[PDB]
């Protein structure tokens with residue numbers, strides 16, 4: 001199956017997922033000089049005060065922190081979005097060293113990692129139906145740079161030893177995702193895709209301009225995870241990012257003047 005190595009990685013995905021060469025693939029490079037302020041964007045609303053986290057899972061590609069999406073609790077609305085988008089999970093992409101790991105780039109700069117908070121449009125009723133729609137998903141992307149520790153990330157870091165290998169999960173209740181945000185909600189937005197197979201072109205991307213800082217020790221613990229299952233030869237879970245794809249017939253809009 002698909003993965004990130006030289007034999008099953010991003011350059012191979014198109015053979016089983018031909019949309020990999022499609023017209024609105026993600027991630028992209030964000031050329032900050034070409035991005036334009038868009039006065040039609042409404043204020044962005046990140047409303048996570050009632051979020052209900054449930055579980056953390058090593059899925060063999062990354063780890064997902066999963067939420068109760070059975071009602072409207074943690075949601076995203078406003079900005080480029082029509083209506084209501086429920087939070088279902090977050091995960092990260094990261095590198096083998098600090099100089100790479102992000103999926104989006106900023107004037108070709110690669111960050112050490114990138115956080116994706118994944119939401120689905122409730123008008124469509126379930127995630128599977130949402131991924132049959134052009135406007136089914138909204139992903140809030142946040143860059144990570146290495147510097148001071150992020151206190152709101154430490155609970156995630158410390159549970160990773162219990163989910164080292166593919167298929168392991170652990171309870172992860174009472175986690176507040178608000179602790180993963182930066183101060184500013186300035187953002188860039190464009191229409192794109194899932195960044196892993198099946199690469200479906202359903203996503204409104206909202207990428208925050210301000211990175212969060214995490215410590216070297218925090219990201220080093222991400223890099224101790226394994227792609228493989230228990231008992232199998234160890235393959236460190238690193239470099240689980242797709243490189244930037246062609247922008248094609250798109251424009252990146254900015255929320256700020």
Ligand SMILES: OC[C@H]1O[C@@H](O)[C@H](O)[C@@H](O)[C@@H]1O
Pocket residue numbers: 049050051052173174175176
């Ligand atoms: O426990 C994490 C978070 O869970 C939410 O459901 C609560 O309303 C928040 O006050 C709390 O910070």
Ligand SMILES: OC[C@H]1O[C@@H](O)[C@H](O)[C@@H](O)[C@@H]1O
Pocket residue numbers: 036251
């Ligand atoms: O025709 C002019 C229009 O061109 C579009 O490509 C831009 O997105 C708009 O901001 C602009 O007003």
Ligand SMILES: OC[C@H]1O[C@H](O)[C@H](O)[C@@H](O)[C@@H]1O
Pocket residue numbers: 155159171172173174175176
């Ligand atoms: O909030 C996420 C998790 O953080 C810590 O691991 C707590 O010990 C655990 O009870 C909680 O589920």
Ligand SMILES: NS(=O)(=O)c1ccccc1F
Pocket residue numbers: 001002003007008009012013014015016017
């Ligand atoms: N297209 S793919 O899913 O990455 C893939 C799957 C299995 C073997 C080789 C491959 F390249």
Ligand SMILES: NS(=O)(=O)c1ccccc1F
Pocket residue numbers: 116118139193194195196197
């Ligand atoms: N990395 S992403 O685009 O947020 C993503 C989210 C959900 C499923 C597959 C994905 F690829």
Ligand SMILES: [Zn+2]
Pocket residue numbers: 091092093116195
């Ligand atoms: Zn992602």
